[PDB]
Design a protein around this nucleic acid. Structure first.
Ligand SMILES: Nc1ncnc2c1ncn2[C@H]1CC[C@@H](COP(=O)(O)OP(=O)(O)OP(=O)(O)O)O1
Ligand SMILES: [Mg+2]
Length: 528
DNA sequence: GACCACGGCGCA
DNA sequence: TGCGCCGTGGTC
């Protein structure tokens, strides 16, 4: 079985990395498998040149590493993408192998043979699933290539800016900590939620709103604290200390230490097989959760900058998931708001900012928000919130109808579907415990929405990418409903016009897709 | 050194 | 609703 390297063309590849992150990994071993043969390469890096496409489990990763090494080696078939389309709970090679007749090993050879067999079985199970087959060829498989090029490109970080910002923020943090300690009458580890809990609820006269989920301690979460705002001057200082040490410990300090030596840029991983709805995730580091909603957060966004001679182009679908819902439900009054190009969190507010009472709820229909989350996060009475939630479902009848429609059907089939037929199996829809059944219901009806928006965005990236190469531009990040591009300073405005139209027309619905676009020297300014 | 559970929170 | 990462407390 053991044939000499190189392997027959179009064989399944296995490979061992020294660590998960392709951009930081040493390629320990490389092998291939085809026609019941196993070809282990004598020297991994050398053998990498002999490939025309990575084909096998985790193809994108190997391709990202090749790309890092100058080799233009594109990802192709991946048994992982197939498994993920069958059941999005297939997020792992350990899980997938086990499930479809293999064993995820630490040997490149056994991994290559695992890639061959696994693909055989998985691809057979997709014979009969034409909509899932359409997604795999037209969206997923091509997408993996686009993602390999985003991961290899990276985004430029303003290191010295973050260094200086760390020093400023550390001083403020010290001031908040000293204030908190004076109000507490004694020092303690303010990072420790346990010690904090004793201080607030025991030593002080503070009431305890709620409990934590797994161990039932008195919660010191932000929600609980915002309620205790007026109850004591220490609370306010703790809210500020929380925000500052969150942003410092998670972004300001770690990010500068991840610049790659060769490239001088920051490289995330876009996980294509991670979420239950069809969305991408990002890790090592996560760049889909860089701060923005706060002033300190926005100072962190500025750190992300264009290469010298380039600009960033930030494109951003407006009310993406809402528009998807209008199309999925077929609700008249809702479509005739987007078609009239009318403000959504204002024209929905007309059925003062009795208008964020339109936004925070528009968001809270997708998630299945309860009258509570609404009132207690809207700073108004409880039944003032309930009235709002019923006034909304009066204006938009077919929404309620689509939600119930989707749940009934998901009970019978055991799964739900995006506009394109991406599935998520939801088993507890017939659980006999109300809280479990109803939790199942909320992820069941949210999935078609969220996952359809993700399908549209994925398809938009697959269509946009080739147009960018032609124009000398590059795609840097995706944040669920936003894209960040990088273009030569001279063609920025042409690229912005173009990317915008590609995204708006990705797949026409019963409602228009409006995209906002900004250009700037940094991520903050590129969003107008 | 690695890893785990938890509470907590950054973003969409 | 969907993620990934932080420090703390803790095990191995
Ligand atoms: N506070 C929140 N809670 C839950 N989901 C949220 C959220 N904020 C955003 N999302 C999710 C849901 C959709 C998306 C929200 O993006 P935009 O904040 O930009 O809201 P948009 O609909 O575009 O209206 P615009 O604000 O521009 O007036 O991320
Ligand atoms: Mg927006």
């Amino acid at each position: 079985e053991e044939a000499p390297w190189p392997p027959p063309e179009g064989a399944f590849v296995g490979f061992v990395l020294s660590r998960k992150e392709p951009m930081w990994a040493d390629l320990l071993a490389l092998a291939a498998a085809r026609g019941g043969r196993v070809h282990r390469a004598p020297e991994p890096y050398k053998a990498l040149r002999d490939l025309k496409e990575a084909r096998g489990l985790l193809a994108k990763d190997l391709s990202v590493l090749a790309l890092r090494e100058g080799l233009g080696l594109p990802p192709g078939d991946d048994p992982m993408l197939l498994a993920y389309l069958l059941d999005p709970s297939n997020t792992t090679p350990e899980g997938v192998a086990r499930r479809y007749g293999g064993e995820w090993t630490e040997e490149a050879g056994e991994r290559a043979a695992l890639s061959e067999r696994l693909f055989a079985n998985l691809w057979g199970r997709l014979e009969g699933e034409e909509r899932l087959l359409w997604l795999y060829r037209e969206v997923e498989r091509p997408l993996s290539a686009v993602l390999a090029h985003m991961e290899a490109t990276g985004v430029r970080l303003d290191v010295a800016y973050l260094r200086a910002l760390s020093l400023e923020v550390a001083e403020e943090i010290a001031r908040l900590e000293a204030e908190v300690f004076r109000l507490a009458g004694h020092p303690f580890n303010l990072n420790s939620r346990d010690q904090l809990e004793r201080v607030l609820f025991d030593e002080l006269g503070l009431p305890a709103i709620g409990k934590t989920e797994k161990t039932g301690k008195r919660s010191t979460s932000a929600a609980v604290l915002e309620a205790l705002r007026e109850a004591h001057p220490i609370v306010e200082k703790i809210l500020q200390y929380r925000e500052l040490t969150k942003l410092k410990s998670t972004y300001i300090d770690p990010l500068p230490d991840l610049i790659h030596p060769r490239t001088g840029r920051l490289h995330t991983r876009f996980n294509q097989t991670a979420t239950a709805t069809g969305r991408l995730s990002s890790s090592d580091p996560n760049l889909q959760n860089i701060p923005v909603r706060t002033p300190l957060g926005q100072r962190i966004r500025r750190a992300f900058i264009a290469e010298e001679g380039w600009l960033l182009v930030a494109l951003d679908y407006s009310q993406k998931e809402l528009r998807v819902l209008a199309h999925l439900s077929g609700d008249e009054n809702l479509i005739r708001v987007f078609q009239e190009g009318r403000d959504i969190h204002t024209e929905t507010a007309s059925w003062p900012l009795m208008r964020r009472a339109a936004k925070t709820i528009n968001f809270g229909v997708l998630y299945g928000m309860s009258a509570h989350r609404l009132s207690q996060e809207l700073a108004i009475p409880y039944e003032e919130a309930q009235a709002f939630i019923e006034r909304y479902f009066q204006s938009f009848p077919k929404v309620r109808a689509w939600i119930e429609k989707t749940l009934e059907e998901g009970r019978r089939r055991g799964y739900v579907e995006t506009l394109f037929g991406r599935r998520r199996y939801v088993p507890d829809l017939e659980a006999r415990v109300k809280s479990v059944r109803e939790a199942a219901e909320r992820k069941a009806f949210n999935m078609p929405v969220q996952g359809t928006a993700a399908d549209l965005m994925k398809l938009a990236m697959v269509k946009l990418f080739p147009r960018l190469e032609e124009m000398g531009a590059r795609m840097l990040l995706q944040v669920h409903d936003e894209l960040v591009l990088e273009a030569p300073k001279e063609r920025a405005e042409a690229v912005a016009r173009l990317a915008k139209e590609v995204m708006e027309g990705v797949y026409p619905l019963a409602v228009p897709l409006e995209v906002e676009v900004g250009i700037g020297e940094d991520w903050l300014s590129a969003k107008e």
